[PDB]
Design a protein around this ligand. Structure first.
Ligand code: CLA
Ligand code: CLA
Ligand code: CLA
Ligand code: CLA
Ligand code: CLA
Ligand code: CLA
Ligand code: CLA
Ligand SMILES: CCCCCCCCCCCCCCCC(=O)OC[C@H](COP(=O)(O)OC[C@@H](O)CO)OC(=O)CCCCCCCCCCCCCCC
Ligand SMILES: CC1=C(C#C\C(C)=C/C=C\C(C)=C\C=C\C=C(C)\C=C\C=C(/C)C#CC2=C(C)C[C@@H](O)CC2(C)C)C(C)(C)C[C@H](O)C1
Ligand SMILES: CC1=C(C#C/C(C)=C/C=C/C(C)=C/C=C/C=C(C)/C=C/C=C(C)/C=C/C2=C(C)CCCC2(C)C)C(C)(C)C[C@H](O)C1
Ligand SMILES: CC1=C(C/C=C(\C)CCC[C@H](C)CCC[C@H](C)CCCC(C)C)C(=O)c2ccccc2C1=O
Lengths: 68, 742, 170, 42, 166
């Protein structure tokens, strides 16, 4: 079984970083919707959902490979 | 908003008036009968909604409500199966002794001596042995009593009533508009995330919370009557945590991404459960949970009222290259306007999925005690193979129906469909050539081996003790998949299935699963399968691509999808429609699936299924005869057809005698089918003229003038009775043989 | 505008007060899809069954016929399945229910009220107003007895006691 | 009884199914109460 | 027109017209612009009333207990079957509220949070608006207080007034 870790500040740091990267990426790449004008609740929900998805994937991969 | 709910209220009044007027849906048929042809036309075109009206909205509403009616019928069938399992079955005795009690959920009344069909199935019970596999499903679901089966039947009856009420409401009271039906993006989002995703999530919940503890107690040897009720497994966390200690940690590891703590009830063990011969239920629980996660993620892809999401029209129009002109442009309009194109695609996919289900379910038995239930395995493989083949041919048929009716060349200029039409001759010629090549270098090997064995030259045959055709690629794939645990799948304890290689999993001195080696005969029969599938593709694709016109008939689209001919001219234009191509492709599908199930039955009976005895040797049902006999047609004729039909023809005076009766009856009806298939309409019409004279002599001629069945109806009736006869013959032969020897 | 009984629910459009006892209570919208004549026939039949059932639960434990053995009514159902009296009662109820089918078919044509079986041999309703009053009383007692019969049977199922002995202690 | 429902019940397939089931029920009950009638008994 | 936070301004939605009681101009995520107004108002008032009843229940149980013997009370009453005996009337009343909320979303005359219930008669006339304001503020205060005291129970296993006096 791949090793997973209990919740810590590193896990929070990766998850927060993944959320902030996904918010900026959703700000830049979404075609149909000063820089944060038009930023709505569905776009925030979609970006933060991708942030949780990316953070979960990154946390599991780094816990597998030992970076923790 | 763009995706919204639009409904018309009370569009059709609920009345019994049109119930008394047969043919009300068709302006031609509403005038009433004059000939007997009218009756057949009334029952043949009734659910062909697009030929009665040009309004797409009414057609879509009819389709939606007919789908509700089918769902009601399916729920009634499921409720019936649960009730007949509850009241007329030996399910508790099977739960106590799975390896010695034959499942049986049908009991006959004693009327004319048919009570002999209530055979001794064990457990102090008499009834007809059932092979649908419901007992193993209920054991996998954790059903330990017949009271739960009664409640399941009540739930099925309530859902059938709910579906039929929903059909009446959603046609007759509140019918959705055409704009409601034309939301492909919303339908895919809801059906991917809610139907498949939440369904997988709730079934993973049921498996984790109910199925795993009950099945763990069952495999440990606890009797079903002392096993705790499922709600006690829900509320008593200690009772669960004796069996799976990670439940003592609660939902904190889930939300904190410490998922490996849950590694005891969500596993990736693979292989089979040694006690039951089925898949590990923890593996299935992680599997359906992962499918739930993947489906809910996939269900947020498509654009909706809010700005996020993909547009499928943009995706289709963006994918175009230099070889393909305009590319995938215009397909979104086709699939959002023509129901027949969607029916073609969905029937093709459901057929392929059913075939995948058959293969993957024989090879990896998912249910406890289903692997050693050889009749259940053979029955579900053959049944889902036949359903898959039928659905694939139906996808081709309704593709042809789209091509004849709904295709518009103005909206399809230089797209993929137009270019496929524009090189149809190259497609059909190359496919025809490869089909002849496959026929020669596959069937002539069998003919050649028959001649060589008949000529007394065994060294000139294609066999493993002669000139070899070794299946090196499939054997290499088997070696990779056997080597996959720990090398390319490091977290798997065992292989995905033992059919690729490994140990002999045996349950109750009967082989659950063992390695399935591939030799010269397997090479020849797999290339026979490839040959038959390519020829079926040739027939169906040639019918679809030449449905609108050809060099023979330049105006075939004006004649329609379904016409008998264009006259005796041009040499003869008989069976020129796409419908007749479907008519022939159904025969070739029958041939293909028949050869597939014959290969399956013989190979499992000869190399996989059998009894394990002392010193670990496996005694197979037919003693390993497949390697030396399946290389000739004579070996198939003698060691498979002649040898294994002994059980169905000596079943008279026993409980399986009904299969013998059905065997004879199918033998009758198939031959009766040739009377329609080989003959023509004019002979029967003149004979009907003579019979009409006879009835006129006694002044007993009917007002509705009797006519012979139409040429298309003659072909369809011959095909229907042919398929019924062949499938029933294989059904009786397979079931009698596998119940007797397995 | 709104329902008289539930002030925050709108009045159901088919509940216009033509049936005595109407207080506009139909939150699920059963009267919006189904015929109200059928619903009122079902309501009155269920209610009359429940009234007779509750009176039977009281009297049949107060008194028992000498030509029958003594037992509780719930066990009396299972006993009279096997003795055969329950088959007789089911047969005669079915025989009356055939003409109930005919009466319902007459109701669906609008030629018969959904509760009129024209059964008044003691002439208890002389004029209109008393009959309207007795309809309101019958509907209210019907609903009350429909609740009360389920109370009686479920309380027997939990306590294994008949009503009047549960009244004496707890 | 609605006359349109009765007219639908009077159609050939419904009446055909009902009459053939009724005939089958006669044969079934006759063979249940008087089985094994290979012959007319003398 | 109260503007809660000046940099973001007042959201331009169906809400914050001024007719809704209790508006402070506070919706930074602009959740009002994507979900219906009346649904959110009904949800807020129902959450607030449930939290008022919860806080009053915690206070009253810590003061006094009915003769005859927080989350542990939930578990012990599930073991007693008491929680089912409160689940049934809330379930029926909430199905009737399902009906009412569906009708209200359909465009009936019912205002959100209005159940037509005024036996004392305090609301009739000019009082009702002010009472609505009082209700929504007390509701929000109840959702803050209950959410505090429960985590307080999680840390100490002790009741809030009993924590206060100790
Ligand atoms: C910090 C970043 C990070 C890191 C280091 C990793 C690292 C890893 N991830 Mg991971 N992941 C990340 C981010 C990251 N991921 C993100 C952001 C997500 C999105 C949520 C995921 C989602 C994810 C999933 C869902 C899975 C992993 C898995 C894995 C492990 C796989 C090891 C391997 O050999 O692959 C396997 C390599 C293969 C070649 C296997 C083949 C995989 C399939 C069968 C191929 C299918 C191809 C298909 C047929 C299409 C081909 C046809 C084509 C022509 C079109 C690896 C340690 C896997 C895991 O946990 O395993 C224990 C796993 O299942 N990752
Ligand atoms: C997430 C919401 C959702 C769900 C679950 C479904 C589910 C379904 N749709 Mg569907 N649909 C949806 C949204 C949804 N739809 C939307 C938004 C649209 C408009 C764009 C459509 C338009 C649409 C059409 C046009 C058609 C369907 C059809 C179907 C059925 C496919 C047959 C099947 O597999 O039945 C088996 C699967 C089951 C789950 C069986 C149970 C059936 C009931 C209805 C499920 C009810 C679940 C309920 C919501 C939750 C209760 C569960 C639990 C809490 C008690 C299936 C029941 C087809 C059909 O057959 O229609 C009748 C069809 O032709 N849908
Ligand atoms: C839709 C599917 C579904 C449903 C309805 C449920 C329902 C339930 N789960 Mg469950 N569960 C599911 C899927 C599902 N599960 C899946 C897919 C997993 C694997 C990740 C789990 C893993 C899981 C665990 C590990 C636990 C539950 C628990 C519970 C119970 C909730 C009690 C609670 O809040 O404890 C919350 C407990 C805390 C400590 C917080 C309840 C019977 C809990 C329970 O009572 O055990 C029986 C519990 O401990 N579930
Ligand atoms: C998803 C399933 C599905 C759906 C919804 C449809 C829907 C439709 N098809 Mg299609 N089709 C399907 C699957 C489907 N088909 C499959 C799988 C095949 C391959 C066999 C076909 C082959 C096909 C052809 C060749 C044609 C259609 C036609 C039609 C249309 C009218 C059908 C009609 O009125 O029949 C009314 C219903 C009947 C006639 C009842 C048929 C009864 C069958 C033949 C006998 C059943 C035997 C039974 C199972 C066993 C009894 C044995 C016992 C006595 C011992 C309609 C749009 C026709 C059309 O006009 O299209 C425009 C047409 O020409 N389809
Ligand atoms: C067992 C009987 C039988 C046989 C042998 C064939 C053979 C053939 N059918 Mg046919 N068919 C049959 C029954 C049969 N059919 C029936 C019952 C139906 C009912 C619906 C159909 C419906 C049908 C359709 C609808 C189609 C075919 C097609 C074909 C051809 C496929 C190409 C191929 O495989 O070449 C290989 C040839 C063989 C396997 C024949 C045997 C030859 C072997 C190798 C021995 C050769 C010996 C040698 C020549 C002898 C020389 C001696 C010298 C004195 C002459 C082929 C000619 C398809 C076609 O023509 O497209 C290409 C096509 O579209 N058939
Ligand atoms: C107390 C309940 C009650 C009430 C108020 C009514 C009221 C009514 N019924 Mg009704 N009915 C009831 C119960 C009731 N019914 C039951 C249980 C049945 C099933 C047997 C029926 C069957 C029935 C039919 C079939 C018909 C009516 C009709 C009527 C209407 C005519 C007025 C009339 O004569 O009733 C006045 C009734 C009373 C004043 C009740 C008197 C009760 C006395 C006190 C005797 C009590 C029984 C006694 C205690 C048992 C002795 C046993 C011993 C051991 C103690 C009126 C609206 C008719 C109608 O609608 O057409 C106009 C009609 O056709 N009813
Ligand atoms: C507001 C609701 C309420 C009320 C009014 C009562 C009232 C009563 N309960 Mg009670 N009870 C309640 C809720 C309530 N309970 C709940 C929710 C539970 C479940 C925890 C219980 C569990 C319970 C038990 C287990 C017992 C009682 C008992 C009693 C009686 C005590 C005798 C007396 O006069 O008190 C004493 C006198 C004074 C306080 C005056 C000084 C009394 C009638 C007892 C009883 O009836 O004994 C036979 C008993 O054994 N109750
Ligand atoms: C394999 C075929 C393959 O490689 O196709 C690749 C090629 C796809 O061409 P394009 O890159 O122009 O296609 C773009 C679109 O088809 C999809 O976006 O297809 C053809 O050349 C036509 C089919 C030839 C098929 C010959 C048989
Ligand atoms: C409308 C209407 C009617 C009505 C009505 C009703 C039932 C009226 C009102 C009912 C209620 C329950 C009102 C409650 C208001 C305010 C509260 C509870 C304040 C603070 C609470 C909390 C969270 C706290 C706290 C705290 C404490 C002490 C301890 C620590 O934790 C800390 C903290 C400081 C946080 C009736 C039926 C009369 C009829 C009328 O015709 C119409
Ligand atoms: C199976 C079986 C048998 C049996 C049996 C029989 C005869 C079973 C009968 C069962 C019955 C009649 C059950 C009734 C339940 C009524 C309920 C829950 C009412 C709820 C009312 C509510 C919530 C009201 C709410 C309300 C209130 C407060 C007031 C305002 C309105 C409203 C909001 C509606 C036997 C005995 C024959 C024996 C056999 O061997 C086995
Ligand atoms: C036999 C035959 C017929 C004759 C079939 C007749 C015309 C139709 C038979 C249908 C009967 C009447 C219904 C089913 C028969 C039942 C067993 C008994 C009849 C019940 C009556 C009360 C109707 C064709 O019309 C035909 C057409 C084209 C190619 C081949 C053939 C063909 O082989």
């Amino acid at each position: 079984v791949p090793q997973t870790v209990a919740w810590s500040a590193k896990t929070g740091a990766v998850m927060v970083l993944s959320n902030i990267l996904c918010i900026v990426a959703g700000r830049y790449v979404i075609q149909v919707k000063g820089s944060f004008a038009g930023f709505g609740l569905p776009e925030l929900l979609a970006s933060t959902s991708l942030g949780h998805i990316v953070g979960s994937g990154a946390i599991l991969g780094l816990s597998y490979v030992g970076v923790l | 908003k763009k995706v919204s709910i639009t409904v018309d209220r009370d569009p059709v009044a609920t009345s019994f008036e049109k119930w008394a007027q047969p043919g009300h849906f068709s302006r031609t048929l509403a005038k009433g009968p004059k000939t007997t042809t009218w009756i057949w036309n009334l029952h043949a075109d009734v659910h062909d909604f697009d030929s009665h009206t040009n309004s797409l909205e009414d057609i879509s509403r009819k389709i939606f409500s007919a789908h509700f009616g089918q769902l009601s019928i399916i729920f009634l069938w499921l409720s019936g199966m649960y009730f007949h399992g509850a009241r007329f079955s030996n399910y508790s005795a099977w739960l106590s002794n799975p390896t010695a009690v034959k499942p049986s959920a049908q009991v006959v009344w004693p009327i004319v001596g048919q009570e002999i069909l209530n055979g001794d199935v064990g457990g102090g019970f008499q009834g007809v042995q059932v092979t649908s596999g419901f007992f193993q499903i209920w054991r996998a679901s954790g059903i330990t009593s017949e009271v739960e089966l009664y409640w399941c039947a009540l739930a099925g009856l309530l859902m059938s009533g709910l579906m039929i009420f929903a059909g009446w409401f959603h046609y007759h009271k509140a019918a959705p508009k055409l704009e409601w039906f034309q939301n492909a993006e919303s339908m895919l989002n809801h059906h991917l995330s809610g139907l498949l995703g939440l369904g997988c999530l709730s079934w993973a919940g049921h498996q984790i919370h109910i199925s795993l503890p009950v099945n763990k107690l069952l495999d440990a040897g606890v009797a079903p009557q002392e096993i705790p009720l499922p709600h006690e497994f829900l509320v008593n966390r200690d009772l669960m945590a004796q069996l799976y200690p990670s439940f003592s940690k609660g939902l904190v590891p889930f939300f904190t991404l410490n998922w490996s703590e849950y590694s005891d009830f969500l596993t990736f063990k693979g292989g089979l459960n040694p006690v039951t011969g089925g898949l590990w239920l923890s593996d299935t629980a992680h599997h359906h949970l992962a499918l739930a996660v993947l489906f809910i993620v996939a269900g947020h892809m498509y654009r909706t009222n809010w700005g996020i999401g993909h547009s499928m029209k943009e995706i289709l129009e963006a994918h175009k290259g230099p070889f393909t002109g305009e590319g995938h442009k215009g397909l979104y309009e086709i699939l959002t306007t023509s129901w027949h194109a969607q029916l073609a695609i969905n029937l093709a996919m459901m057929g392929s999925v059913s075939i995948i289900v058959a293969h993957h379910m024989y090879a990896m038995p998912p249910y406890p005690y289903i692997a050693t239930d050889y009749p259940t395995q053979l029955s579900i493989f053959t049944h889902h193979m036949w359903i898959g083949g039928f659905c694939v041919v139906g996808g081709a048929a309704h593709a042809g129906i789209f091509m004849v009716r709904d295709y518009n060349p103005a909206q399809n200029y230089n797209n993929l469909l137009d270019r496929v039409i524009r090189h149809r001759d190259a497609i059909i010629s190359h496919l025809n050539w490869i089909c002849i090549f496959l026929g020669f270098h596959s069937f002539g090997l069998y003919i050649h081996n028959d001649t060589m064995r008949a000529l007394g030259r065994t060294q000139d045959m294609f066999s493993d003790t002669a000139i070899q055709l070794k299946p090196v690629f499939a054997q290499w794939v088997q070696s990779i998949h056997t080597l996959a645990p720990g090398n390319t799948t490091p977290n798997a304890l065992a292989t995905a299935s033992y059919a690729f290689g490994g140990d002999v999993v045996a349950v109750g001195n009967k082989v659950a699963m063992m390695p399935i080696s591939l030799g010269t005969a397997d090479f020849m029969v797999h290339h026979i399968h490839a040959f038959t599938i390519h020829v079926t593709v040739l027939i169906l694709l040639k019918g679809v691509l030449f449905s609108r016109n050809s060099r023979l008939i330049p105006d075939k689209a004006n004649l329609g999808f379904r016409f008998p001919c264009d006259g005796p001219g041009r040499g003869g234009t008989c069976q020129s429609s796409a419908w007749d191509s479907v008519f022939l492709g159904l025969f070739w599908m029958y041939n293909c699936i028949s050869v597939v199930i014959f290969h399956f039955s013989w190979k499992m009976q000869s190399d996989v299924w059998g009894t394990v005895q002392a010193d670990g040797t496996v005694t197979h049902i037919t003693g390993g005869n497949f390697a030396q006999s399946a290389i000739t047609i004579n070996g198939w004729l003698r060691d498979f057809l002649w040898a294994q039909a002994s059980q169905v023809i000596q079943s008279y005076g026993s409980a399986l005698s009904a299969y013998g009766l059905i065997f004879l009856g199918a033998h009758f009806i198939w031959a009766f089918s040739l009377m329609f298939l080989f003959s023509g309409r004019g002979y029967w019409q003149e004979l009907i003229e003579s019979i009409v004279w006879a009835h006129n002599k006694l002044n007993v001629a009917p007002a509705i003038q009797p006519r012979a069945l139409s040429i298309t109806q003659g072909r369809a009736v011959g095909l229907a009775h042919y398929l019924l006869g062949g499938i029933g013959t294989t059904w009786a032969f397979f079931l009698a043989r596998i119940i007797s020897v397995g | 505008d709104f329902s008289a009984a539930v002030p925050f629910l709108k009045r159901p459009t088919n509940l216009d007060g033509q049936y005595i006892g109407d207080v506009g209570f139909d939150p699920l919208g059963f009267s919006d899809v189904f015929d109200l004549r059928v619903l009122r026939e079902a309501e009155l039949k269920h209610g009359r069954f429940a009234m007779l059932a509750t009176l039977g639960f009281i009297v049949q434990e107060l008194y028992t016929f000498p030509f029958f053995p003594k037992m509780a009514p719930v066990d009396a159902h299972d006993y009279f399945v096997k003795q055969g009296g329950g088959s007789q009662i089911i047969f005669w109820i079915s025989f009356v229910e055939l003409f109930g089918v005919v009466a319902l078919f007459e109701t669906l044509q609008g030629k018969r009220e959904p509760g009129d079986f024209a059964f008044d041999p003691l002439g208890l309703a002389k004029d209109e107003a008393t009959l309207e009053r007795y309809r309101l009383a019958e509907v209210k007692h019907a609903r009350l007895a429909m609740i009360a019969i389920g109370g009686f049977i479920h309380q027997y199922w939990v306590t294994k006691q008949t009503v009047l002995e549960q009244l004496g202690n707890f | 009884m609605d006359s349109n429902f009765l007219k639908y019940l009077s159609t050939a397939p419904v009446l055909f199914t009902v009459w053939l089931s009724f005939t089958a029920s006669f044969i079934i009950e006759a063979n249940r109460f008087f089985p094994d009638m290979l012959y007319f008994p003398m | 027109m109260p503007v809660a936070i000046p940099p973001l301004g007042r959201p331009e939605t169906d809400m914050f017209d001024g007719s809704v009681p209790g508006d402070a101009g506070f919706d930074p995520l602009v959740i009002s612009g994507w979900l219906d107004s009346r649904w959110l108002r009904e949800a807020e008032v129902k959450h607030g009333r449930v939290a008022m009843l919860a806080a009053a229940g915690c206070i009253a149980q810590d003061l006094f207990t009915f003769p005859g013997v927080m989350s542990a009370l939930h578990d012990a009453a599930v073991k007693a079957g008491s929680m089912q005996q409160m689940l049934w009337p809330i379930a029926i009343l909430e199905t009737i509220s399902i009906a009412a909320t569906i009708q209200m979303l359909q465009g009936s005359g019912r205002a959100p949070g209005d159940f037509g219930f005024d036996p004392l008669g305090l609301g009739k006339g000019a009082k009702a608006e002010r009472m609505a304001l009082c209700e929504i503020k007390n509701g929000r205060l109840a959702m803050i207080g209950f959410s505090g005291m429960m985590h307080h129970y999680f840390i100490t296993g002790k009741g809030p007034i009993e924590l206060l006096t100790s």
